[PDB]
Amino acid sequence: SPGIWQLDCTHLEGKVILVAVHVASGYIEAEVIPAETGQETAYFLLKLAGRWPVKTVHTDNGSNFTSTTVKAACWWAGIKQEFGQGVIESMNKELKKIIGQVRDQAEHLKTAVQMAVFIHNKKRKGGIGGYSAGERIVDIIATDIQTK
Amino acid sequence: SPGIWQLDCTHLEGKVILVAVHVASGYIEAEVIPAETGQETAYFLLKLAGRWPVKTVHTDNGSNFTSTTVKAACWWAGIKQEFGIPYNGVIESMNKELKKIIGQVRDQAEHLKTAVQMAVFIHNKKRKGGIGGYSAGERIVDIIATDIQT
Amino acid sequence: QNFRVYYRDSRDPVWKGPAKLLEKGEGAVVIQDNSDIKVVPRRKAKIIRDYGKQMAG
Amino acid sequence: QNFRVYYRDSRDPVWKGPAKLLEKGEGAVVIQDNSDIKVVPRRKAKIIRDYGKQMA
Ligand SMILES: Cc1nc2c(cc(C)n2Cc2cnn(C)c2)c(-c2ccc(Cl)cc2)c1[C@H](OC(C)(C)C)C(=O)O
Ligand SMILES: Cc1nc2c(cc(C)n2Cc2cnn(C)c2)c(-c2ccc(Cl)cc2)c1[C@H](OC(C)(C)C)C(=O)O
Ligand SMILES: [Mg+2]
Ligand SMILES: [Mg+2]
C-alpha cells in the first residue's frame, strides 16, 4: 500500500540514526536523534505522518518502538503498528555506504546523513524509463489519490 | 513552479519556528529550531531538499537566511535563493494559520514542538472544500506527479 | 472522539497503557486498563485523542 | 566550477563568500572572491561542491 513504512535504528561515530523506508518505493527518511528513546522516535513519527501518508509502520521490538510515546503518536495519527522482508536492512546498509562516500563533505554526521538521504532519494535508476525513489513514492501516492 | 518554496521564521512561547511553504500547493513544513541561526536553517533546508523538489527558495534578509551556511546548502543541492526586497505574504499568511491551528491543539501536548507537528499534520491533510475538496498534501503530490510525467 | 490513556501507577516508573478513559476530573482521571478500573492523578496520565486520524480517514 | 568556497578573512567573525577555488593545499586554500585572490588557512575555509545538484 502507499502507507506501509519500515522503521529501524542504526549506529555510526557513536550516534543514533533513526531510519524510515517507504517499502513500495525505496524512498527513505533518516535523522540523527540525541538518544534512542521512545520520545525521540515518537516525535520523528509525528513529523513523518504529517508529510507522507503513514498508515502502517513495521518495526522490531526495540524499546523505543514499543514505548507508550510511540503508541500515543500512532493512536493520534491513526497508524497501525506491526512488530513482525529485508527492505529496511537493504536500505540501512545503502545509507551507510552513501554516508561514507560523502562523509568528507561535512563536519557533522547529521549533515552527512541528510546528504545521503538526498542522494538516495534523488539519484534515478539508469535505464530507459528510470525513476528515482522520490519519484516512485510520489507516483504511488498520486495514483492512490485518483482512486478516491 | 512545482519547486518554489517560501521560508520564514515565526515565534511562539519564546521559541523559534522555522516554516516552509510550497507556494503552489499551500503544503507546509515547520520545526521548532533551538536557535534562529543559519546553521539550523541550513540543516532544515538540506532535509527539506532531500524530501521534496526544492529548486527555488524565497526568504527575507534575516541573518539566518543570508548566512553562508544556507548559501552552501543551496549550492550543494542546486537551489536558487531569491531574497525579498527590503520594505515590500504567502508565508506570513501561513505563519498566521499555523499559529491558529497550534492554538486549537495546544492542550493536546506538553511541548510546543509536538503541537507544531500536530498543526502541520492537520494543515496538510485537512481538505479544502470538505469531503469533495483536496488537501495541501494531495495538491503538492499532484503538482509533482504531473511535473514528473512531463 | 475515542480517547486513550497512558499512565504511571504511583511509585512505579513503568508507563502503562493503552487504557480507556471513563472520566476526567480536575485532579484525577478514572480509566480502565484491560478490566481493572483505576483512579490516577491527572499529572500521572497522558490522554490521547485520535484527532489526526479524524482529520482525513 | 563545481566548487564554491566560503571563508573567514581575518579575526572578523563574519564568514565571507561565495568564492571560486583556485587550489586546495594541505594547510592553505587559494581562492578568488570577486576579483581579489586570497590565500586562506584551511581551517578558515569551507569548500562546497554542487554534488547534490549533480545527482538528478
Ligand atoms: C558545521 C558547518 N559549518 C559551515 C557550513 C558552511 C559554512 C560557510 N560553515 C561555517 C559557518 C558556521 N556558522 N557560520 C555563520 C558560518 C556547513 C555546511 C552547510 C551546507 C552543506 Cl551542503 C555542507 C556543509 C556545516 C555543516 O553543518 C551544518 C549543515 C551547518 C549543521 C557541516 O556538518 O559541515
Ligand atoms: C513529552 C510527552 N510525553 C509523553 C507522550 C505520551 C506519553 C505516554 N508520554 C509520557 C512518557 C513515556 N515515556 N517517556 C520517556 C515519557 C507525549 C505525546 C506523544 C504523542 C502525541 Cl500525538 C502527543 C503527546 C509527549 C509529547 O512530547 C513528545 C512527542 C514525546 C516529544 C508532548 O509534547 O506532550
Ligand atoms: Mg532495532
Ligand atoms: Mg521574517
Side-chain angles (χ1 to χ4, degrees), chain A residues 8 10 46-47 54 65 68 78 93 103 112 114 119 129-130 134-135 137 148:
Chain A
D8 194 26
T10 188
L46 290 176
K47 275 191 292 189
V54 183
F65 295 117
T68 49
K93 153 267 168 300
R103 189 67 187 79
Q114 300 309 332
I119 293 158
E135 295 171 327
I137 189 170
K148 156 61 193 191

Coordinates of all heavy atoms in Angstrom, one line a residue, chain A residues 8 10 13 46-47 54 65 68 78 93 103 112 114 119 129-130 134-135 137 148, unseen atoms left out:
Chain A
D8 N 13.6 1.6 11.7 CA 14.6 0.9 12.5 C 15.7 1.9 12.9 O 15.7 3.1 12.4 CB 15.3 -0.3 11.7 CG 16.1 -1.2 12.7 OD1 15.8 -1.2 13.9 OD2 17.0 -1.8 12.2
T10 N 19.9 2.5 13.4 CA 21.3 2.1 13.1 C 22.2 3.0 13.8 O 21.8 4.1 14.3 CB 21.5 2.0 11.6 OG1 22.8 1.4 11.4 CG2 21.5 3.4 11.0
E13 CA 30.6 7.6 15.3 C 29.8 7.7 16.6 O 29.7 8.8 17.2 CB 30.3 8.8 14.4 CG 30.5 8.4 12.9 CD 30.9 9.6 12.0 OE1 30.9 10.8 12.5 OE2 31.3 9.4 10.9
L46 N 5.6 11.5 14.4 CA 4.6 12.5 14.1 C 5.0 13.4 12.9 O 4.1 13.7 12.1 CB 4.5 13.4 15.4 CG 3.8 12.8 16.6 CD1 3.9 13.7 17.8 CD2 2.4 12.3 16.3
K47 N 6.3 13.8 12.8 CA 6.7 14.5 11.7 C 6.5 13.8 10.4 O 5.9 14.3 9.4 CB 8.2 14.9 11.8 CG 8.4 16.2 12.6 CD 9.8 16.7 12.6 CE 10.8 15.7 13.3 NZ 12.1 16.3 13.4
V54 N 1.1 7.8 6.3 CA 1.7 6.8 7.2 C 0.5 6.1 7.8 O -0.1 6.6 8.7 CB 2.7 7.3 8.2 CG1 3.2 6.1 9.0 CG2 3.8 8.1 7.5
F65 N 10.5 1.6 20.0 CA 9.4 1.5 19.1 C 8.1 1.0 19.9 O 7.0 1.2 19.5 CB 9.7 0.5 18.0 CG 10.7 1.1 17.0 CD1 12.0 0.4 16.9 CD2 10.5 2.2 16.3 CE1 12.9 0.9 16.0 CE2 11.5 2.7 15.5 CZ 12.7 2.1 15.3
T68 N 5.3 3.7 25.1 CA 3.9 4.3 25.1 C 3.9 5.6 24.3 O 2.8 5.9 23.8 CB 3.5 4.5 26.6 OG1 4.5 5.2 27.3 CG2 3.1 3.2 27.3
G78 N -3.5 7.8 13.7 CA -4.2 6.7 13.0 C -3.2 5.7 12.3 O -3.5 5.3 11.2
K93 N 22.0 -0.4 5.0 CA 23.3 -0.6 4.5 C 23.6 0.4 3.4 O 24.7 1.0 3.3 CB 23.5 -2.0 4.1 CG 24.6 -2.2 3.0 CD 24.0 -2.1 1.6 CE 25.0 -1.9 0.5 NZ 25.8 -0.6 0.8
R103 N 31.2 11.5 3.4 CA 31.5 11.9 4.8 C 32.4 13.1 4.8 O 32.2 14.0 5.7 CB 32.1 10.7 5.6 CG 32.2 11.0 7.1 CD 30.9 11.1 7.8 NE 31.0 11.5 9.2 CZ 31.2 12.7 9.6 NH1 31.3 13.7 8.7 NH2 31.4 13.0 10.9
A112 N 26.1 14.8 7.1 CA 26.3 13.7 6.1 C 25.1 12.8 5.9 O 24.8 12.3 4.8 CB 27.5 12.9 6.5
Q114 N 21.9 13.6 6.0 CA 20.9 14.2 5.2 C 21.4 14.3 3.7 O 20.6 14.2 2.8 CB 20.6 15.6 5.7 CG 20.0 15.6 7.1 CD 18.9 14.6 7.2 OE1 18.2 14.4 6.3 NE2 18.7 14.1 8.4
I119 N 20.8 12.1 -1.7 CA 21.4 11.4 -2.9 C 20.6 10.1 -3.1 O 20.3 9.8 -4.3 CB 22.9 11.0 -2.6 CG1 23.7 12.3 -2.6 CG2 23.4 10.1 -3.7 CD1 25.0 12.2 -1.8
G129 N 13.4 4.8 -19.1 CA 12.2 4.9 -18.2 C 12.6 4.9 -16.8 O 11.7 4.6 -15.9
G130 N 13.8 5.1 -16.4 CA 14.2 5.0 -15.0 C 13.7 6.2 -14.2 O 13.6 7.3 -14.7
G134 N 12.4 9.1 -4.9 CA 11.5 10.2 -4.6 C 10.3 10.2 -5.6 O 9.2 10.6 -5.3
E135 N 10.6 9.9 -6.9 CA 9.6 10.0 -7.9 C 8.6 8.8 -7.8 O 7.4 8.9 -8.0 CB 10.2 9.9 -9.3 CG 11.0 11.2 -9.6 CD 11.8 11.1 -10.9 OE1 12.3 10.0 -11.2 OE2 12.0 12.1 -11.6
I137 N 7.7 7.2 -5.0 CA 6.7 7.4 -3.9 C 5.7 8.4 -4.3 O 4.5 8.2 -4.0 CB 7.4 7.8 -2.6 CG1 6.5 7.8 -1.4 CG2 8.1 9.2 -2.7 CD1 7.1 8.0 0.0
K148 N -10.1 7.5 -5.3 CA -10.7 8.0 -4.1 C -12.0 8.6 -4.4 O -13.0 8.3 -3.7 CB -9.8 9.0 -3.4 CG -10.5 10.0 -2.4 CD -11.2 9.3 -1.3 CE -12.2 10.2 -0.6 NZ -12.7 9.6 0.7

